[PDB]
Assembly symmetry: D2
Homo-oligomer: 266 residues x 4
């Protein structure tokens, strides 16, 4: 009669998979992912840090861009994550096998990473990737220091329980630049109200909007560059139109309120 | 010359290890641990639930008390935890091997349980126990239903990041009894202010005092019975002097404020 | 220019995904998977055992067939595996979440299962599935007893390091039937000689042919029924043409020797 | 009445905990553990390798000896293990947190390491330590290359399922020296015959004696130096009386045969 359906691959817009050369954000901070997925390399005298890696198939491209920047596999010391979905943490397991890197994450992100995104609160097993283990668990507001660049974790639960903003201070034209890599604030297809798998979902998003609004934030970056109005293909003007953290949080809250109203009506 | 020190066993007051026969709390709820460590058995037509197990060496005693209650190893379906320290989650791994039980816990408790209490935020590796894996991850306010007894998780971070209160409604003398198993609110030897491993420790405790104060709570129980003024050796009056959740939270907050003042002075 | 390739779903022949009603093998043993993937249910008075589950998307179908047999989710006690590839262990994680079942496996299978088939010795990350944890680790020749049905593990490394044959004795028409569920002995696209990830691959296959040849084996079943000449769609004659364990081992060794010769020539 | 017993710490002879300064074995190989527990540091231009760490409380001493040798925490790249018992893998988790090191191990050792030595086939939970995760799984005969020093794994199951000998070639006085770090071949208090948790124990030991006998072995070292007649406190003559691999294997087999005979008589 009728067989069960074939497994469906997690397919994405081509621009999410379009390689780009490294794009400099500040003196030691570079975008090294694809046109439409952020993966940030921060280079110190004491090794390099990667914040996100994008999709599972991006590992070799990331390593090629690291090499172009002078970062060998032994020089990658630390991987940090915005959240542990397949389009941001996809290549983490492979990167750990191929480099010196260790992963630091909060408990919620660590648990999701260790199950490869399976049993997701909203997606089930629809979007999985190779599992990886965290080497260090961080708490809210904890700092991690690499070569005198201090990264601070700001938990902003909602998009996932373990969603995190990472902040650090780099320099540009001699002057300090407070960089905020704020996680996604979307809720794509989520049941927001009365969700048995996430009962306090709405309260957590509301707190997260407030957290993002208050981040130290001369420059905002986001896992999907379009969410913060970055255009990584625009060269010297890639960041010209970027939102402030305040504007990003307000836009996300307006969208969220509209989604709540539509859910009540549906 | 001088060898490194021998490993130090986690030794406890004898009353924490003193077996007791099952003590009935409500129609389907029993204390089955030791004189000074709580381990609650809730019996349903659809299997039994255990909330905490005490110290690592308590597994056989727990199984003996379960048998006395008519609960065979196959009948134990679920283990819930207040927090994943050795004196409350100690025998979980062994219980999983010897029974049908699966563990449900929040992400923070799951991560700590899976490392057997090692790399504790405050105790380091001083207090470890056999590691165990969680089978289900719960979110704040999520319910788990076993035989029509509905258990609700109320996160109350502080004592550990993953500290949880569990509430359910049983009956006694025909009437509903709202039981609150509230976690520890102590901070034994903790650095409270400016702790790099737990930057928001104070805010989390303060929120947790408020959470405990508001629990549905006709009867309060706690992992250390003395914290809620239970005396499990007092028979028909074991619960007579028990605190309300409001009184427990107020006493814990007063103690916490005193500890903060002493830390500033030290 | 040219984006990175999209992820490729693990797609299989339709017959591997074609549901079938339960097919009785012996008094307490049933095939409950699909036309072309084995999943064996053994029913005891003390709960049920499942040997393999097939593809990830088969979980609900398996539970439906279990219900048809009188096995509720609480009644499934144990899951055993031939090997931890996606087409045999695919739905294990989901089955553990939805039933009482615990997994017993050898260390090699447990490690591969816990990474969801990622970093496979031969397939890399090409064929992954939701990760799961084993609850009990077994050694070669160890027995597991459920309701007086004794299952014996016979390690037969090669297809995977952790490949296992499981044997047990059921009855049929009053008489004992020694059932052998022997794992795959294929090496699909494998580098056999001088493989740096599996240096003793050839010796292990040769030992495994000998192990299979000697199993107690009135009835042979295999994860892919065609490998043992079963036809699960043939009804009362589904097993009529089945190979002996001796014939299965000889055919596998002949094929393996041909593959070695072709590898030397390529 | 009578409380349950207190947990018993894993206590050892003082010499196992007696720190020593680094002792040179060959041009790039040093003993850096204690008088009576081996922990080998191999120094390359491309980072350092540690084979075993001894007891849990040895981590800081190991790091101090690494510093004395010019190896900073970032320079430690790889940890290899003989077997995953507390007196050899004890400080692995802590070393991973404090250095750049990643662990490579076979599946059996990885599973035991990840449960911190709990549920041991012979010791139960009597001898546990902080759990750690392996970063790479190795197969029998696989090589790992660090700075042109090639380490080969030779599985020698028995003492634990995952027991491994590691071999490599260093130099001394200009000439190549084939170093064999062979695991323990003891069976302390083990049930050897008919052990349900290890049915093929005897066959595995017998194969392991043969494996050790045949290792490339100009210099033999063992996790307990006394097993190979090393005296790490004897300075320039520490290795003078060391056994060959052939002599070590023969002595272990003679002892094993005596233990079998005594078990039959008991
Ligand atoms: C579903 C996405 C995907 C998944 C995840 O991570 O959850 C992942 C598992 O696949 N990652 C997401 C995230 O926030 O990280 C979500 S959100 C994504 C970003 N941006 C797209 C978009 O919908 N753009 C749009 C459409 C119409 C008008 C306008 C305008 O210009 O106003 C913009 C969609
Ligand atoms: C250190 C304890 C131990 C550890 C843990 O879990 O962290 C575990 C790892 O060991 N579990 C604790 C917890 O809260 O769960 C802490 S707190 C414990 C309970 N009650 C004791 C107590 O100090 N009593 C006392 C003393 C003087 C006067 C009075 C009075 O009557 O006012 C009372 C101490
Ligand atoms: C690649 C398969 C798949 C993977 C795995 O598990 O490794 C999984 C990850 O996808 N599972 C396999 C296994 O042995 O478990 C391998 S082998 C499969 C069975 N049977 C097919 C077959 O090739 N049949 C054939 C063709 C021509 C003539 C004749 C004849 O009649 O002689 C038969 C192929
Ligand atoms: C129990 C030990 C301990 C445990 C382990 O790892 O399993 C660990 C968990 O604690 N590690 C061991 C191992 O082989 O790795 C075993 S064996 C240890 C070495 N050497 C001692 C010895 O008994 N010596 C002796 C006595 C009398 C005469 C003579 C003579 O000179 O002939 C020698 C004992
Ligand atoms: Zn600079
Ligand atoms: Zn996402
Ligand atoms: Zn995304
Ligand atoms: Zn009742
Ligand atoms: Zn505690
Ligand atoms: Zn306690
Ligand atoms: Zn019958
Ligand atoms: Zn396979
Ligand atoms: Zn297959
Ligand atoms: Zn040299
Ligand atoms: Zn040992
Ligand atoms: Zn030892």
């Amino acid at each position: 009669e009728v067989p069960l359906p074939q497994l469906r691959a997690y397919t994405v817009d081509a621009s999410w998979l379009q390689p780009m050369a490294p794009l400099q954000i500040a003196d030691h901070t570079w975008q090294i992912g694809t046109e439409d997925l952020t993966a940030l390399l921060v280079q110190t005298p004491d090794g390099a840090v990667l914040l996100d890696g994008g999709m599972p198939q991006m590992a070799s491209h990331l390593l090629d861009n690291m090499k172009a920047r002078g970062v060998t596999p032994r020089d990658l010391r630390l991987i940090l994550l915005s959240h542990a979905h397949a389009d941001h943490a996809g290549p983490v397991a492979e990167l750990k096998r191929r480099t010196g890197a260790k992963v630091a994450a909060n408990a919620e992100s660590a648990v999701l990473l260790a199950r490869g995104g399976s049993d997701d609160l909203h997606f089930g097993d629809g979007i999985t990737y190779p599992p990886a283990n965290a080497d260090r668990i961080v708490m809210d507001g904890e700092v991690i220091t690499v070569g005198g660049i201090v990264f601070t974790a700001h938990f902003m639960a909602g998009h996932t329980p373990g969603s995190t903003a990472w902040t650090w201070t780099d320099t540009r034209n001699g002057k300090p630049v407070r960089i905020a890599y704020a996680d996604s604030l979307s809720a794509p297809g989520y049941q927001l109200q009365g969700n048995p798998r996430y009962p306090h979902l709405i309260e957590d998003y509301r707190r997260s909007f407030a957290t993002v609004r208050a981040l130290p934030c001369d420059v905002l970056l986001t896992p999907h560059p379009g969410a913060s109005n970055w255009d990584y293909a625009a060269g010297a003007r890639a960041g010209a139109k970027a939102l402030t953290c305040k504007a990003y949080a307000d836009a996300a809250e307006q969208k969220f309120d509209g989604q709540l109203a539509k859910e009540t009506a549906g």
